[PDB]
Ligand binder design. Sequence first.
Ligand SMILES: Nc1ncnc2c1ncn2[C@@H]1O[C@H](COP(=O)(O)OP(=O)(O)O)[C@@H](O)[C@H]1O
Ligand SMILES: Nc1ncnc2c1ncn2[C@@H]1O[C@H](COP(=O)(O)OP(=O)(O)O)[C@@H](O)[C@H]1O
Ligand SMILES: Nc1ncnc2c1ncn2[C@@H]1O[C@H](COP(=O)(O)OP(=O)(O)O)[C@@H](O)[C@H]1O
Ligand code: BEF
Ligand code: BEF
Ligand code: BEF
Ligand SMILES: [K+]
Ligand SMILES: [K+]
Ligand SMILES: [K+]
Ligand SMILES: [Mg+2]
Ligand SMILES: [Mg+2]
Ligand SMILES: [Mg+2]
Lengths: 524, 524, 524
Amino acid sequence: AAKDVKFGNDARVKMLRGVNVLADAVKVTLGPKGRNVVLDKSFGAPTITKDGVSVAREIELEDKFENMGAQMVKEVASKANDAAGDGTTTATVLAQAIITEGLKAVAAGMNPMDLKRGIDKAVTAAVEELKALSVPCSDSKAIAQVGTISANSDETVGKLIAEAMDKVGKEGVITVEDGTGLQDELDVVEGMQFDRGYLSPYFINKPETGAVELESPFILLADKKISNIREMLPVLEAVAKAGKPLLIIAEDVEGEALATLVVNTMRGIVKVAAVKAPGFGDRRKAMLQDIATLTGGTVISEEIGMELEKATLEDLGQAKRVVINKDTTTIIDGVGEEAAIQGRVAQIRQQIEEATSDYDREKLQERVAKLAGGVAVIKVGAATEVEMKEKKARVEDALHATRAAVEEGVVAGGGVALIRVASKLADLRGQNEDQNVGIKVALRAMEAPLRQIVLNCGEEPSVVANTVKGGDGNYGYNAATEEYGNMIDMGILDPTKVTRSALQYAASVAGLMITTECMVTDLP
Amino acid sequence: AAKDVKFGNDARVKMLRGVNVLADAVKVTLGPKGRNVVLDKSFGAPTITKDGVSVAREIELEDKFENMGAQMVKEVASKANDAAGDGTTTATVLAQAIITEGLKAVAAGMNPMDLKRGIDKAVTAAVEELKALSVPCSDSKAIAQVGTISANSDETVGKLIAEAMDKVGKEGVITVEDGTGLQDELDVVEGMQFDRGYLSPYFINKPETGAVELESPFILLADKKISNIREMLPVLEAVAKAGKPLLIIAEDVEGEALATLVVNTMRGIVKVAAVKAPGFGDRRKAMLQDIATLTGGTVISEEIGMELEKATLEDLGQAKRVVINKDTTTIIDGVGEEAAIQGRVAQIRQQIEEATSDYDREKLQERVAKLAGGVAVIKVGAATEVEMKEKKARVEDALHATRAAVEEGVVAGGGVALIRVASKLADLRGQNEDQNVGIKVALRAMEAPLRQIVLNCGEEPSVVANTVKGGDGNYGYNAATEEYGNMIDMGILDPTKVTRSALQYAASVAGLMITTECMVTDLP
Amino acid sequence: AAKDVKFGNDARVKMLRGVNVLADAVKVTLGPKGRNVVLDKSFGAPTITKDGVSVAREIELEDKFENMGAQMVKEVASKANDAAGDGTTTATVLAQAIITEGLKAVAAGMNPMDLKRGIDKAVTAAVEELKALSVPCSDSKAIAQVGTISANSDETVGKLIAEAMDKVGKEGVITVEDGTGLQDELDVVEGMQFDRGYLSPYFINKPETGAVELESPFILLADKKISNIREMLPVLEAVAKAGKPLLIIAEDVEGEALATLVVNTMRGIVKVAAVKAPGFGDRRKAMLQDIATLTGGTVISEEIGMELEKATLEDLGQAKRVVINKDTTTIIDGVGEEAAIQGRVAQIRQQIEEATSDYDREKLQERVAKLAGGVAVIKVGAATEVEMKEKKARVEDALHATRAAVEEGVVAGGGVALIRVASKLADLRGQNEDQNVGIKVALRAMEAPLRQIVLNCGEEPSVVANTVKGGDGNYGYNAATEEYGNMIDMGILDPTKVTRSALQYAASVAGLMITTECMVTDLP
Ligand SMILES: Nc1ncnc2c1ncn2[C@@H]1O[C@H](COP(=O)(O)OP(=O)(O)O)[C@@H](O)[C@H]1O
Ligand SMILES: Nc1ncnc2c1ncn2[C@@H]1O[C@H](COP(=O)(O)OP(=O)(O)O)[C@@H](O)[C@H]1O
Ligand SMILES: Nc1ncnc2c1ncn2[C@@H]1O[C@H](COP(=O)(O)OP(=O)(O)O)[C@@H](O)[C@H]1O
Ligand code: BEF
Ligand code: BEF
Ligand code: BEF
Ligand SMILES: [K+]
Ligand SMILES: [K+]
Ligand SMILES: [K+]
Ligand SMILES: [Mg+2]
Ligand SMILES: [Mg+2]
Ligand SMILES: [Mg+2]
């Protein structure tokens, strides 16, 4: 349809007003003194959130050009959430500061492209400075401190996250789910377990817990489903001579096939149990191959050119104990050789390194943890559902921050690392005056997060920032206690990855935001 | 529906208003000091562009007559983008200038038809002058300079394009894709490769990389659908006796044959691999015949009168190595004799000669490059999506400009080539006074791009144009450095093809536009 | 729906307003100094046009009565375009002048029926006067002049059409088609050609052109679909011993039959090619019989009671060369009897004069040109689509004008033939005073086109018309150079057919529109 075109200062002020609206909506949730934001939801009750990305994703203005500004700024929060999982409010604040100072400099008669180049150069130097400033985070105390800081100063959440990380190990999967009680709950599963239960309720040998328990059993791996007992007689007869229990993991077992098995279990001849293989497609084949590798057995498949009738005792895997419930089964202490286990984990790690999809990487990481490692689930507890949602979001943020800190490292929190980086970049110079102006704009905008934190606390940001810059090292401001001191002793830690990603994304968006000249959009 | 008719000066002023609106929307993105334009998209985030055609393609006015004028002018940018891929803003500016002075002269009582004839004569002379003024562009230095200039003065992308063209050669295709990292990288593949992986994951003999590699194998090319092995018994026996491995390129293989093939592969008797047939239909047959010619083999087809069971060792091709991944298959160092390859490439280029579209042109050119030459891909790296899109657009513009410069040549940049051409045609005459007026209109509008560039830089276009016209040869004005000098020495080049096409299309549209008398359109 | 009725002067005034609106929209494109008109199109870009019928087809007013007036006038241009293909603006101008003067006479108190009768009598006299004034047009110079004049004074298109008509002959087909280059191109076809190509890509023996080249082959014509090879053995064996190639024309051949033909061609036993029978229905059989007559063979048809197994070498035609492409097939120098060809074309033409439809005739002249003569295609070249459309329209107008001039003859152009005719009828009288008034109205309205041309040129029409009327013979006014002289000497020629058609249709519509009393239409 018809379009509307504005040129120059009018377009710039409209875009700046939209950016300011979105930034004012988002930035009030920064720091330990930040407050909540109520987001209307058509499908249900309103949600109370303190996340920057959650607030940003809903802002949408009536004016078209202000909408341009808001939708162009939302990218900073979206990218910072996708990349690191934490630090979106800081990215939005930095983007707003850079946009404001850049527009003010452009209004003074400067070339926007040279300002963009200077900003890019300053950020490139600052990233290296931040990498230099980083310190490794290895002890559990530092991980607990990071988890506490990233969960709105919650000691219990950080302690639980640190304990889960210690229990699971360096390679593992930790997830969060809503609970049923009033307090947080952590459970860890050691070994391999997949959510497939017994097929017939008559396999249970102990109704005390409603579970099927076998000691030192044989493991039969078969991709094809069992339709007739014709293929099952030789292996059953061979196993019956030994007396050890047997476990069947096939695609499916029909009623008549399992009737013979249950009858034989009742008559005391053999002890067998039938469950289904986990997953569909090639995923199920991969799971069954992993099971065979872990249990020291061999998968019997029709596509490879072997028959179930030809199976012997060699093709059957072994385990120390197998427990099957109505919904879950577990195999503990498999007898599979360790060398094959490390080969499999190495191969799947190389497969991960070439996987660019979040779902695939998550599935393969769960695979690696289940094959060798551990899986933990954290059950958060809250009386009400809105409190449930908010606590779950905080715990997810803490988990992501702890993972990032373990990956790369930790710097002083509270916006002090950025202040130090900007302090030791005062001799940076460009090619002409405009590039120097852009460099100075970036350096001055690097101070925004600490000023906003102190403003949220309720003090004078200018004097606090001045006296923080007056010191050196890890000297900072404790927002909670409203006193100065070393920011490492007080336990206020910030991951390097989060700060670096926030700075890079904010600068990248704001540099393009600066150079806009005219906007075209639909008519009102 | 009811129509509205306007006669004469009212229609002319409405058309000029629409032309001015569209031209002013597009014109702010000309030169190295040009600024960006943000475009509204209802599906997703707004896009920020510097391309003239991208800006002009969405401009649409509410008033019907101004809208028709905008639709007239938009065709100049559309055709200049489709023909050469670069130089759309210059074409739009030239068209706007020619329209302006044409209507100004028409308002003085001149005959529009004679003005159009004079403009056509002037442009016809100018094309010959530009062809005479061109200089060859062969070395990599000039290619790098052209790529840098065409990409908003970015040295890295120009150097990357130059060395990629050097690596691929004179007969090859270079494309661009969205990368994942933060830095620009080039990937080049030599030989033949089609995006068809293995048929069964059991063919892998090198699980370290998750791929199967073959050493000096035979290649079997079959059009038929393989479902039973009985036709493959003779060729399988022959290659088992020979000892060298085998590769199957067939339309598809069912599991009955795959089971036998994988059994024989794991048993260590023969080494075989099966892949699908790339392409669909006539293109698939053409590519398979290309593979056969490259490897010195013969295609076995059911419609040609040959059966796979009668194939011998002479019907199997040979190659030094074959690399098959999960997704791609690579054949390197074929055995086919060179004269057959030359004949095939000549034939396919001959079929290229009669290509009526770009869709088949790109596919046939890729086929030619795959037969002889190389294929390279450039993956642009940016933190955010908008930066990625803008960088990709700039890289594509640089690629098109380098291709055009290789095709025809280069002239002095900065819009001074048109100034030299116009100063060389000061003695052109027509048959009457109106034709002379049209010739002078074209010659005076020849100076628009340089004046627009200087105006965008913030200086006075009149003084700079007077100084440039007072020079000789390649004397010009450097917009970035704000200094005068030899523009070939300074490294500012534009292809002759781009300027010639822009001038031709702008004149062609404007000459028709200035002769209009009345407009008819639907009522509001 | 409810209607609105207006009586007498109000209805006549509204009708005249609509007529004036449409005529003023149309008449600005008359003469060599006429300008363009741009027509808004909802789908795509608006079109620059100079045709009277194209402009008239779009005008429709909001007011119902003026809309009816415009719709009644539009039929003059529609019929003039449909009949002769040229001279529609002149018809519209004549109709408007006659309507104006007739309405003035009716308002003065005359009887409309007698005015209509007098107009018809005057036009009947004028038609025979024009037939008396006509002179033959046979030489190529006159055809070139007519083509130049009819194409807005373009020498190149006139010369191209003259040479194309000379090369093709007196009975041929010439069509226009969008070109690729920047210059016009003429493509003439020698021999017979039908739009059908090879069925299987394996018959190709000359990859230099991607086509087959058979030297002195036999032609086998079979009406029935070939699906079994058993019938093919006798004639194939007979032609195998001869050594000459063979071509098969059938409605369709199934791949089972193509397989053995391809194998034989590869092995060098017989050089055969197969193409489909062009067309569908009775015309397919008719022109296949024409193929048989040209090649000197007999159609093997199941409908006649002749079977394919009994065919011999007498039933196969011969030709000097046969060339088949991906889409076309040509028979060069078909051996046949000249008398048979003349008889066949005589039969086809005597069918032609019995054709009562325009669509059903053009195929007949195409067949005549295919049997005897040739066809030509003229490619128009233009940089931009709009210029291509306008140039194609001008070329089509020139083609139609040249055809009409060859058909009937030429008279002095510039609107002076009508002036001479009106001056010859100065003594015509009717039965009463009213019929004399109508005759005078027609005679005075016959001079409108020259006045309109002079007005478009920008001069005083009255003095120029007075000077022209004062001369004799072909004395006229040259609008391009603005000087009087001999019309035939300057080469300004108009066909008699277009002038007669325009006059007749304009009078036929205007006389009927004059006699309106009341008009009834829907309410707004
Ligand atoms: N007690 C404290 N004293 C000073 N600064 C703090 C304290 N606790 C947290 N901070 C700082 O406040 C910031 C909290 O940001 P947050 O509200 O989680 O938004 P986001 O993590 O999305 O940027 C952290 O960067 C941290 O450095
Ligand atoms: N440093 C420079 N000094 C002077 N002129 C330049 C310089 N860089 C580019 N130009 C000129 O500016 C033009 C850039 O056009 P651009 O904005 O890319 O639009 P388009 O290429 O679509 O016409 C080129 O034609 C080039 O001649
Ligand atoms: N050079 C000329 N001098 C005088 N009259 C001309 C000249 N060229 C063309 N004409 C006249 O002008 C008329 C052109 O009509 P045109 O605008 O083509 O509309 P149409 O052919 O549809 O009636 C012709 O009838 C011709 O007689
Ligand atoms: F603002 Be982030 F989600 F801590
Ligand atoms: F302005 Be063009 F797209 F380089
Ligand atoms: F306007 Be006509 F068709 F020459
Ligand atoms: K927050
Ligand atoms: K541009
Ligand atoms: K006309
Ligand atoms: Mg946080
Ligand atoms: Mg460019
Ligand atoms: Mg005409």
